[PDB]
Design brief:
5-stranded mixed beta sheet, Genome polyprotein, binds zinc ion, Alpha-Beta Plaits, two-stranded antiparallel ribbon, about 575 residues, binds ligand TQC, about 10% strand
């Protein structure tokens, strides 16, 4: 406890010895308060907004740009629950480990990443990776970790940001999980890491093909707040697959940063608090993703065990029930993993039958309480894979004019248009604002080509931004290559669900949803505002061209039937 956290605490106290105070009015029950010391608006993208004028009067779009879970306690599962989790976790790390070799990620790898802008004494991250002084601090902390002690690895809430060095040491020990695709669908069977939105629909349709009951897609209420110390201890068992230095380094991340955290929080009453808790999820967002997937795969196999009646009670597991769990895992575990699509805290399960809907004792006792349903009310499943929610999407079946079948991602259009108009920072330039619009426009042309309004707005944005100006899972839209060529590569050539590889010659071969389906999913097709916008699009394109100035532009609008003379 204070032995593992104090040094970190003691060091902060000294940096602010002229402003240290144990406020007796601390607003914390579950977090441990140690002391206190003295101490992000969403901006509108104008290129995108000028080219989506109809949406200026839709509150669901315009409101998106305007403007008690952490402080809670989770009860320790029953002994029978803890046994189910340990046995399942042990077996799950072995399966993930069968065709993967743990390893340490390198200064070299970490450096390169910071130079390509991935979200993770010196101004930026880039400058710190060059200064050998930094690495000397990394070395100091690094050798502290090998002795089982920590000094500078402290979480700052705002999301859990850390100093680049603690990020490096986290990445050094556990980066392999992401960098080497442990949660790929090949190596994990339930995972979808590296798959892409253009593959998730096909993956859900494949789960649909299995004999079984309804498809279940229960969200957890505040997943990262419901991670128990028993969960963090089952995650740590990845170190059993490790050796030498790596093993020691990983053990220290788990022991000193995950299973015993130190955090600094801003409280307007503006002081900085220094609270400590052993539970809940607090890692980098990328290690969080992988350990979430891991623990969710474990929770969902156990819920599947409960509905198949492998065990009778969570209160206590008989000796023979343990043998039966172990034998279920060996006999059918891989088959049961294949019945699920899991992305962090998000899941879809097609169980053997609908007893799963009412198998709630283990799930609730593990603390993974379902969102927006009474603790003991049975799950409502989906009968059609095209109605199931997953990663903020649903998936349509869309037949091309030549019989070939696309499975395409979709969500409420007002959400898509709302996101494209929003970013962060007051520092950016017009060329950079224009670059993001193209990044959104190119994503829309690759993922949402089947929505009439987004294909039109994507064509307008690409016509309004200089042709050679580059745009900012997989991200095939981040390129200067012609979008019709990328579409053919992603939806035809590299698509394992498409047998006939005949390239599409033009955008007009590429179909839309039915007009009524497009309206159901939020299209303004049929409105008077939308007809005026489409008819007069060249004038909106010219408004943006005049603002950016005398640059080299392309007209992409004749790629659509209605503008092609
Ligand atoms: C390039 N980039 C990455 C993240 N955000 C941006 C960005 N660029 O321009 C803008 C302005 C604020 C609204 C439009 N944001
Ligand atoms: Zn440390
Ligand atoms: Zn839809």
């Amino acid at each position: 406890n204070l032995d593992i956290i104090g040094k970190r605490i003691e060091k902060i106290k000294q940096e602010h010895e002229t402003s240290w105070h144990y406020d007796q009015d601390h607003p914390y029950k579950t977090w441990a308060y140690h002391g206190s010391y003295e101490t992000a608006s969403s901006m509108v993208n104008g290129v995108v907004r000028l080219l989506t004028k109809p949406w200026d009067i839709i509150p669901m779009v315009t409101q998106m740009a305007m403007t008690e879970k952490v402080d809670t306690r989770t009860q320790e599962p029953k002994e029978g629950t803890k046994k189910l989790m340990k046995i399942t976790a042990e077996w799950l790390w072995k399966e993930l480990g069968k065709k993967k070799t743990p390893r340490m990620c390198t200064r070299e790898e970490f450096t390169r990443k910071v130079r390509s802008n991935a979200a993770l004494k010196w101004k930026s991250a880039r400058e710190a990776v060059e200064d050998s002084g930094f690495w000397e601090l990394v070395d100091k902390e690094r050798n502290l970790h090998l002795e089982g002690k920590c000094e500078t690895c402290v979480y700052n809430m705002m999301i859990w940001y850390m100093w680049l060095g603690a990020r490096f040491l986290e990445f050094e020990a556990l980066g392999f999980l992401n960098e080497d695709h442990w949660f790929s669908r090949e190596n994990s069977l339930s995972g979808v890491e590296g798959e892409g939105l253009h593959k998730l629909g096909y993956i859900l349709r494949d789960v649909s093909k299995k004999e079984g009951g309804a498809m279940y897609a229960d969200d957890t209420a505040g997943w990262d707040t419901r991670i128990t110390l028993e969960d963090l201890k089952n995650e740590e068992m990845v170190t059993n697959h490790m050796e030498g230095e790596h093993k020691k380094l990983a053990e220290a991340i788990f022991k000193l940063t995950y299973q015993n955290k130190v955090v600094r929080v801003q409280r307007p009453t503006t002081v900085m608090d220094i609270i400590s808790r052993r539970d809940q999820r607090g890692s980098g967002q990328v290690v969080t993703y992988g350990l979430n997937t891991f623990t969710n795969m474990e929770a969902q196999l156990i819920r599947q065990m409960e509905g198949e009646g492998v065990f009778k009670s969570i209160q206590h597991l008989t000796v023979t029930e343990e043998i039966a769990v172990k034998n279920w895992l060996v006999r059918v575990g891989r088959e049961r993993l294949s019945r699920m699509a899991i992305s962090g805290d998000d899941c879809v399960v097609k169980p053997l039958d609908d007893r799963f809907a009412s198998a709630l004792t283990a799930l609730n006792d593990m603390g993974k309480v379902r969102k927006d349903i009474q603790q003991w009310e049975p799950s409502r499943g989906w009968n059609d894979w095209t109605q199931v929610p997953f990663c903020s999407h649903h998936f349509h079946e869309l037949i091309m004019k030549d019989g070939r079948v696309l499975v395409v991602p979709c969500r409420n259009q007002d959400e898509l248009i709302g996101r494209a108009r929003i970013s962060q920072g007051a520092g950016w330039s017009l060329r950079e604002t224009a670059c993001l619009g193209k990044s959104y426009a190119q994503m829309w042309s690759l993922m949402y080509f089947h929505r009439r309004d987004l294909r039109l707005a994507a064509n307008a944005i690409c016509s309004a931004v200089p042709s050679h100006w580059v745009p900012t899972a997989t991200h095939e839209w981040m390129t200067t290559e012609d979008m019709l060529t990328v579409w053919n590569r992603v939806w035809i050539q590299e698509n394992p669900w498409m047998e006939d590889k005949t390239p599409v010659e033009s955008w007009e071969e590429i179909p839309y949803l039915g007009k009524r389906e497009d309206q159901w999913c939020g299209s303004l097709i049929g409105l008077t505002s939308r007809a005026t916008w489409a008819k007069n699009i060249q004038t909106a394109i010219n408004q943006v061209r005049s603002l950016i100035g005398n640059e080299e532009y392309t007209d992409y609008m004749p790629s659509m039937k209605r503008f092609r003379r």
